Design a protein around this nucleic acid. Structure first.
Ligand SMILES: [Mg+2]
Ligand SMILES: [Mg+2]
Ligand SMILES: [Zn+2]
Lengths: 159, 132, 138, 44, 176
RNA sequence: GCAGCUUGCUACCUCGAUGUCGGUUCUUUCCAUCCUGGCCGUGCAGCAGCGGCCAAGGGUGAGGUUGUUCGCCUAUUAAA
RNA sequence: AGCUUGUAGUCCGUAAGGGAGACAACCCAGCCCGUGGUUAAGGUCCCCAAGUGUCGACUAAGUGUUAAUACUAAAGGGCGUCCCAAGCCCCAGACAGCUGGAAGGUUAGCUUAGAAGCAGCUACCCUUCAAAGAGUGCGUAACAGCUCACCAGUCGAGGUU
């Protein structure tokens, strides 16, 4: 289905596993990227959201893939630590008769967000800051909401 | 093609059956379409003297029969006028099996042919014997 | 008489329309072919071309081509020409291309408001140019 | 025939990579659509 | 520091400049040239071998216009003092060309097997001279000579083939 | 994201009746361009191609099966 | 979905009169008859009663000139233009140009003859002088110069992220 079919937040949440049935799995495999064992990156930037919405897991997977490729290509395999944050807990249902017993059935999973809520986070050195911004800008292109980039730690270093 | 001195009405009509007058091996043909003719709505394609048109063999030898070929009209029963003022007509329509250029497959033509096809297609002129 | 030498079109039309409606003697606009229409060249030409070719032949809008006809039509819209007051007002207006012989040497006045000197930039066209672009010999 | 002046004023220009408009040499911006990337007119 | 929007031109001896009404007039040993440079918000004065031009608002449009007018004034005085020249060149592979000056046009005959010779207009008093495989274009008006050269170049362009293999016409080896 | 040119969803108007599908005749409108006019790129030598931009003035036909729209096929044609 | 089914308030149904272009339920107002007066909503270039009103800026697109609204186009981009803040270099001299320099060695490793800075390991090819390079490109079997990066003289005020 199209992206805008399930993107607005108009109705209550629907997430209790034990009551619904037959929720399909997910594609996102790993939520931590890069050098997990390192903890000495002085710059910590992140991608934030400007509006409430629902993000499908497929969009998150595409954004993660593109950011991974860019960061590994330019910064290096050991020069960063990316970490996705929001996990998809919501469930999406698509009716499939007419309006007779129109209640839908599970077709997917989505992750609700909130304004100014961090989605991604990348830590790098001082020399690979522009590459980090370049990587995080492409990832927000696959995402269903307007997105801005905020440098959380080491702002005085970069700025 | 090269212009003709005379004016030729388009007498024969797509669907007509003509008696081919050469020694190639066919007797009767069926005009399917006319080369270099656009047309308008509802109008059947038509052909006159010195018009190259694709036909179909209806009566003839078994090898030639059921073959789409090219041919031109050498006579027509519908009158047409000379440059200096006169009208010429024939008793019967006729056609000769040829190629795209104009070389007729037959080396012998029976009966007269109009002189205007003789000027447009010189080969038909030479291969003929009597021209009127 | 009023000289339309270098005056804004709508400003001139509004002033003339109001002081026709107030009720007086008749008024004369001369040189109604170098009145100014502020705006870029292309937009003005486009809008006037669309206005020109818009009607149906039996009953559609017949937009005029001559310059004084255009100015008269522009004033015709700021005025209740279907009522009796508006028709009487329209009977007392005369816009001439150039200067007619009888109004030769006549005393003139101008609307001090509608002045091209009161315009920020040089983005304007003159009425005769649009008239000739619409295909009129004047 | 490859001559200096002809190549100088014929095939020494950059090409917008989106609308195919030809630009000047020392440029980085299509003059009609503003696309960032400009290639160079193909040589032999 | 300051964003003052004034410009001086320092007119040289010989040129009798003026700013009557709006048209800017000059005269010198190389004839005379005329131009009109009116624009709201941009005032120009002529005095003591120099023309001062400036504006009032520091908007970038005003600054661009003051630069443009100063450049035009410099080019006008330079043209009237001595003049401006443009050099071009001829190239051909198989078909020799007959460049011949006649009237106010330059006729190009036998261009790539051409029976109908092409026509290039000459603007103003821009006297052109043909000599073998090169053309020299004299004049006192800079825009005039530039536009004449542009017309001559644009008329002789072959527009149905490949520039790799066909390269003929007239090309500018040096601008005005 | 656009269109409302396919099929769906709804039940706001019409049941003291708004005469259905296809074809025929005749007139007109749109452009999201098949040909004709003008340009740009090419992994464009020429011929002929491939991709894109402006442009709605004119053209866009004849036949076999089938009630067919749609679709298949035939010989022309600048394009059908 | 101008869809379907709930809930609190107020309305139309059964609600005049004034204003919204016309508008069942939107704003002012809930209305016996006649006369005078001042205001509400909303407006004041002309149609049309009353401002071609005042102060400070923005827009160049006829964009706009459309309270709510079933009647109003999105992501993305803009060295288009107007502002704020933060860093960096700076008249003993910053940027764009005018200039040349980019000489030591090398012709780098390369089998094809040859990919000799520009297929394919390497490393700053000079102890040293602004410059001197394993180096981009017109050229380029390989190159080569021409020279990239990279600094140096030169103007003469702001430049740049
Ligand atoms: Mg009530
Ligand atoms: Mg009411
Ligand atoms: Zn472009």
């Amino acid at each position: 289905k199209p992206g805008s079919m399930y993107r607005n937040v108009r109705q209550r949440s629907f997430t209790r596993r034990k009551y619904m049935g037959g929720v399909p799995g997910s594609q996102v495999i790993h939520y931590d990227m890069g050098d997990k064992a390192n903890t000495s990156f002085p710059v910590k930037i992140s991608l934030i959201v400007e509006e409430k919405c629902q993000i499908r897991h497929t969009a998150l997977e595409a954004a993660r893939i593109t950011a991974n490729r860019h960061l590994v290509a330019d910064t290096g395999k050991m020069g960063f630590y990316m970490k996705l944050r929001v996990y998809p807990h919501e469930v999406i249902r698509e009716n499939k008769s007419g309006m007779r017993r129109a209640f839908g059935k599970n077709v997917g999973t989505a992750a609700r967000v909130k304004p100014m809520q961090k989605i991604f986070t990348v830590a790098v050195e001082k020399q690979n800051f522009k590459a980090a911004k370049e990587a995080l800008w492409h990832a927000g292109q696959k995402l269903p909401t307007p997105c801005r980039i905020v440098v959380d730690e080491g702002a005085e270093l970069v700025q | 093609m090269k212009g003709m001195r005379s004016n030729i009405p388009r007498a024969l009509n797509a669907g007509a059956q003509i008696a081919c007058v050469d020694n190639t091996g066919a007797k009767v043909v069926e005009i399917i379409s006319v080369k270099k003719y656009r047309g308008v709505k509802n109008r059947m394609p038509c052909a006159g003297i010195g018009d190259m048109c694709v036909v179909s063999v209806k009566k003839g030898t078994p090898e030639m029969r059921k073959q789409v070929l090219l041919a031109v009209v050498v006579r027509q029963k519908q009158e047409f006028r000379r440059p200096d003022g006169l009208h010429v007509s024939f008793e019967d329509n006729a056609m000769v099996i040829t190629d795209e250029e104009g070389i007729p497959k037959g080396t012998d033509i029976k009966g007269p042919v109009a002189r205007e096809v003789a000027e447009r297609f010189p080969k038909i002129g030479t291969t003929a014997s009597i021209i009127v | 008489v009023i000289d339309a030498k270098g005056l804004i079109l709508g400003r001139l039309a509004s002033s003339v329309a109001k002081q026709l409606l107030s009720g007086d003697e008749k008024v004369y606009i001369i040189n109604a072919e170098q009145a100014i229409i502020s705006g870029s060249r292309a937009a003005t030409l486009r809008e006037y071309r669309e206005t020109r070719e818009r009607g149906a032949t039996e009953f559609g809008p017949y937009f005029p081509k001559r310059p004084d006809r255009i100015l008269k039509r522009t004033i015709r819209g700021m005025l209740p020409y279907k009522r009796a007051r508006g028709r009487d007002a329209m009977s007392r207006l005369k816009v001439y291309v150039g200067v007619p012989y009888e109004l030769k040497g006549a005393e003139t006045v101008t609307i001090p408001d509608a002045d091209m000197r009161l315009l920020s930039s040089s983005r304007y066209v003159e009425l005769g140019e649009v008239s000739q672009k619409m295909g009129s010999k004047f | 025939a490859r001559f200096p002046e002809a190549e100088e004023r014929l095939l020494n220009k950059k090409i917008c990579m989106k609308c195919n408009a030809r630009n000047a040499i020392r440029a980085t911006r299509c003059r009609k659509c503003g696309y960032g990337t400009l290639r160079v007119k193909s040589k032999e | 520091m300051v964003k003052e929007i004034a410009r001086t031109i320092e007119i040289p001896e010989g040129v009798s400049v003026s700013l009557a009404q709006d048209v800017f007039t000059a005269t010198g040993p190389k004839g005379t040239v005329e131009r009109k440079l009116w624009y709201p918000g941009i005032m120009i004065d002529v005095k003591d071998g120099e023309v001062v031009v400036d504006a009032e608002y520091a908007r970038k449009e005003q600054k661009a216009m003051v630069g443009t007018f100063a450049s035009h004034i410099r080019n006008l005085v330079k043209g009237v003092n001595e003049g401006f020249e443009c050099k071009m060149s001829i190239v051909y592979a198989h078909f020799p060309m007959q460049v011949k000056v006649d009237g106010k046009t330059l006729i190009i005959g036998n261009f790539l097997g051409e029976k109908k010779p092409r026509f290039a207009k000459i603007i103003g008093e821009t006297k052109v001279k043909v000599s073998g495989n090169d053309v020299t274009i004299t004049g006192i008006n800079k825009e005039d000579v530039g536009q004449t050269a542009a017309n001559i170049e644009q008329k002789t362009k072959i527009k149905r083939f490949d520039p790799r293999i066909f390269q003929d016409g007239i090309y500018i080896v040096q601008k005005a």
